Design a binder for this molecule. Sequence first.
Ligand SMILES: *SCC1=CC(C)(C)N(O)C1(C)C
Length: 164
Amino acid sequence: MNIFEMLRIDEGLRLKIYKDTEGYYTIGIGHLLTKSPSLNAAKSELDKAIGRNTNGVITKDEAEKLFNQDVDAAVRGILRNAKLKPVYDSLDAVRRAALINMVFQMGETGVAGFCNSLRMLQQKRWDEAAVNLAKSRWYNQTPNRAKRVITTFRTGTWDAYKNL
Ligand SMILES: *SCC1=CC(C)(C)N(O)C1(C)C
């Protein structure tokens, strides 16, 4: 297991534009196109992202290319963020993957405001951090995924993704 395999489990793979759990047009392995309700707007984003006129359908290789860019961007975003970089740097590689997963899902600003949980993670108070992380819109709206990410933070193991 690694961050790519973990996010591939959590995000799926679909090669046609679809709406994500928040109702937003997405494609590939969790590549958010736009929060606009216009499908045309989403197609335009997709064509810009891929570099050709797609009319809403991509290949598996294209989905993987966007996915690699999005994982890289999440990590780069963490390392440029004054609230996230210290916690990220304090973590082991498995827990770093859990933080990348959260930033991939909800964005840098979104995770950087989990300040109390970030402090508990910096403190390596893992059970406390897990309890605090669940007191969130994130957990309530995507509880199975959040439970997997939280288990990863609590244990520093991949047990929540074993058998997935
Ligand atoms: S998100 C910034 C932050 C707030 C507080 C909970 C005081 N912290 O310990 C850090 C710096 C994580």
